[PDB]
Paper text:
P-glycoprotein (Pgp, also known as MDR-1 and ABCB1) is a prominent member of the human ATP-binding cassette (ABC) efflux transporters that removes a large variety of chemically unrelated hydrophobic compounds from cells. For Pgp and ABC transporters in general, ATP binding, hydrolysis, and subsequent release of the cleaved products (inorganic phosphate and ADP) fuel large-scale conformational changes that ultimately result in translocation of substrates across the membrane bilayer. To address this fundamental question and overcome the dynamic and transient nature of substrate translocation, we tethered a substrate molecule covalently to specific residues along the putative translocation pathway of Pgp and utilized cryoEM to capture Pgp structures with bound substrate during various stages of transport. In conjunction with molecular dynamics simulations, our structures trace the substrate passage across the membrane and identify conformational changes in transmembrane helix 1 (TM1) as regulators of substrate transport.
L335C in transmembrane helix 6 (TM6) and V978C in TM12 are situated at symmetric positions on opposing TMD halves, while L971C is located two helical turns above V978. Based on the appearance of the yellow DNPT byproduct, Pgp335 and Pgp978 reacted with AAC-DNPT within minutes, while Pgp971 and Pgp302 did not. As no crosslinked substrate was detected in the corresponding IF structure, the substrate was likely transported to residue L971C before the crosslinking reaction could take place. In IF conformations, TM1 is a long, straight helix.
Author numbering: 32 to 616, 689 to 1260
Write the structure that this text describes.
Amino acid sequence: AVSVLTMFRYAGWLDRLYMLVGTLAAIIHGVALPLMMLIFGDMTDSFASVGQVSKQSTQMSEADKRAMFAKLEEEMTTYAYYYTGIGAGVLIVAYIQVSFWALAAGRQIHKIRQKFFHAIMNQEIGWFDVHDVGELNTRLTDDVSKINEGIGDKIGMFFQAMATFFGGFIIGFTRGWKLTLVILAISPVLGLSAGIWAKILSSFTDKELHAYAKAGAVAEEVLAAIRTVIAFGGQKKELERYNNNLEEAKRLGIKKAITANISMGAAFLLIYASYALAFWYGTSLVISKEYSIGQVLTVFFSVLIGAFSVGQASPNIEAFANARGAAYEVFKIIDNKPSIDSFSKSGHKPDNIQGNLEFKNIHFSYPSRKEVQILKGLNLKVKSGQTVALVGNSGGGKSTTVQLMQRLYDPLDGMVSIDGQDIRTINVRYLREIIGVVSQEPVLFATTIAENIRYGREDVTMDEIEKAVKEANAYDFIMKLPHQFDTLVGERGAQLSGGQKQRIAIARALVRNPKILLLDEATSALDTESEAVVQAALDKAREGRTTIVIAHRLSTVRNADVIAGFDGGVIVEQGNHDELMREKGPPASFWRILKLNSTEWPYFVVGIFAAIINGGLQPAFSVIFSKVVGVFTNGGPPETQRQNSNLFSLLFLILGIISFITFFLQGFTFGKAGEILTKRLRYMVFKSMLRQDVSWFDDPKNTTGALTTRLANDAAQVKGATGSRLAVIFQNIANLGTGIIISLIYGWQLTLLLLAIVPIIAIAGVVEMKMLSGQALKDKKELEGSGKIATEAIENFRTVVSLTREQKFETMYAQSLQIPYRNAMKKAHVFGITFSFTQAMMYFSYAAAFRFGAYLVTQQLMTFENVCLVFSAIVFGAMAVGQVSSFAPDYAKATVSASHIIRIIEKTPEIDSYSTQGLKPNMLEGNVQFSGVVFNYPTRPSIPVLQGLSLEVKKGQTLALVGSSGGGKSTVVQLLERFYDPMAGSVFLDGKEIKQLNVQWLRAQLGIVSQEPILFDRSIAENIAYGDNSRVVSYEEIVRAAKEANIHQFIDSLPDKYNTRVGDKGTQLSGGQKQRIAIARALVRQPHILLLDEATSALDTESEKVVQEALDKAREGRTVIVIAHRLSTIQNADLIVVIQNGKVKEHGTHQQLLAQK
Ligand SMILES: C[C@@H]1NC(=O)c2csc(n2)[C@H](CS)NC(=O)c2csc(n2)[C@H](C)NC(=O)c2csc1n2
């Protein structure tokens, strides 16, 4: 499903030369760095030769060694010269490698995007039909961006890394006859351990995902019908399943975190064991006497650099593989032969045609389906100078005759002749330009009408084309109405009426001045005043040239002299219209409250201290590392060098073991702490959402899926925002600080030199990342114009086809893409120069460090063991800082954002709810009054619904309120349970207001029933028992409830009876009975008042007979307010008190017939 070796089809010879020089530049750099490393080994060998104790007399002999110290200084100067030469080479090669590879891509992308646009806009409409409009643009944008990035930088970097690893292993050929054997034999152990630990971690991650899946599902189902939840107030009764699922998820996550931490610790342990074994073997080899320690050190460093190179090569090859599929796809759009070309050489065209089309054997339909036939063959012919009208259900499905006229589609065996000759011989562009169309929707360009008229056809003169706009509504519509100055109209402001749009479309058609005109729904569903005027323009266009018309209303049929229309493919004559029947017509977190949220500092605190000792591993490492060189620096060869080397190897191994156990304890504490925090946050936040009022969920910004994702993925962000980060802070700062202090104790000059130079490279890297990001964002912003052109063109693709003026679109797209293309070349050189500059700064820092170290050694003030000590300590500490900060769990980024979102939603103060302050009366005489209360949706106060309503209810009355809009009326019911809060009026229940009430107690005494009976993923009984939340639990009273609701037969029919469970809609219950079980749930609460809006969800109308039976039984049992926009429901209601918007009272049907039907 991908392609390779052929994605560079459009590459030019200069482009291939650019690539050839670039890749060569990469091998050069990749070879150069291990050359630096080998010269470091020769550097350590020179120091070893100088620091030979030899005879005890020699120490103070030769003028205290002053002469050969001068020789050493000369050698050091030569080595520094070679160092800076290599640095300049690294800078010279880097500029060319990054710039050329990117430059070539810049040109490659410039060619490929233009070719893609040309092909896609040259494609036939049927291809677009089986596709969409937005996803074409999205595919274009993301695929070209990926290809650009990949073939711009990633391939060059990959060749660089591959060459680095190679050159390291060319050194490794010899230096590794003994060393590579052992080092590259212990490396596969590291690889296998990493692989098995990654597999175990992935298995644990999948297990915890499947464990949390149940919690996610229950969250989704409770949030979907949360209105029912707040109607029953089951939040307290809720969350136990959520709590248990989170408990299981937390327990599995503890194991997951333990596994990840032990995997990482094993990684450290294998690294350190490899170090120890390699140095043990190297010390033995150098002690053999035929070898120098510098060669061991340089081969070991070179193979480490090769490992670094292999590790760095992975993202680049991944990006290349990702871009391969996008390249294959984008090329697959290319090279597809369309049905028509419009640019073919075979374009013979007759001159001054009369348009006497003849039609025969028209068998064609939508190409998307080959089962339904729309055109069944029409033996129709037309004549010049006579307007023809088509009448029927539509234009043969949907104006498909028009699609036939200009070759939008390709009829099968459909023979159509414009004047007696086949359309195949005629040029596509000529055929399109000699034919004019009228769109059913006059949608236009987001720009001034002048260029729209220019788009219509070649403007001979602006005044001439303006004269052509002499159709009815001329001048007042073109100038008096659009700001008088010709103005950009379109989606971006300057809206005009549909009459203006149709009129300008007619004007464009007249500018085309075709021999044959096409009219498709000129005033389809337009204003009655908008029509009856543009039809005059249509008529005055029709006397000029022959045309076909399809009319929205039969009036044009009267206007048309010839009426040849039908439906179903049965051709009818056009002699007269008499046969035609009488058709009717958010700030960041303080980071301290977040930490304080973890009130579990004991199981926390040790980890910090544990982390601290971990920070001591890195510099202490270098210490023993330096001492290894200290073995073979100035000292006595035979007394203890073997024993000293063995002792320091044992120190390496015990250091690795203590690091392993340290990181084990670190994991065992931070994982547990983070897991307990994850559980605590989820437990609190879920209660927070169930606590929030209905309005909070109504806001369209937050949706059920959005809140579920908030519960799902806004925890791992905290896992790393709270406990792992402080561990990173403490370990990193302890490492760097102890390295600096040991440097200061063991060094006085070069220590500060390194401490000063490393920050400038760090800030250079940071600023060049910042500049790359800024340039990328600037480019994405300034391609917005080209994106706008592409979107506007593709959205109006049918209009583009209907209008021959199409190459102009390619022209503006090319210009608005080449300006960013020029910006791309300008960015390429800058990117290359900065990357080369930072590499040169790194190499220069290295060279200066070595020069100063050697110079101060010539002063005889710090021994090589100390110079190498401080240098390796600081550099490896900085490397550890970098690796740990990247191995760190994404602190900030999307984590602190989700953290403050979690804090906001938890601390959200909603309208008072679940508040115990609400007064609760012992008994309710159902004294509900609804007089003088006005309110609407808080999210959209645009419509002040519920205006001037007066209503009052006593015990036993059946209030059959029936407003014209059921959904609008639903709000009146929604107010009784305070889903929304009234402000204009007050509602009094039992003679006292409802706002000063125990929300739950009010809800408790309210048997609401929703029109849509959504129930949970629980059993038939577990759902009916949900009504008695915070109440007496129903034990076998459910039998009485079902008997009262008369659904006993269906509960009895179920195999497990009450136990039968509605599991993920398995054994799905009948549509006409879910409302019944909801009614049973409502009557379980046994309230003094019930609310019903059942209406009729489905069309079964049989269980519907049973549902009003249950409703009348309930209403004779207890007082009820029933809402139903159904004639049968209101007629069945004995107490007909139908009132709409407060206009009438009591029985409307007796007062007036308006209520009836
Ligand atoms: C897994 C990841 N490492 C690599 O991807 C990697 C590729 S090559 C390489 N390491 C070389 C030879 S394997 N290593 C050293 O030169 C070295 C000297 S000290 C030191 N590492 C300290 C102990 N390491 C970390 O703190 C640490 C945290 S994460 C991490 N390393």
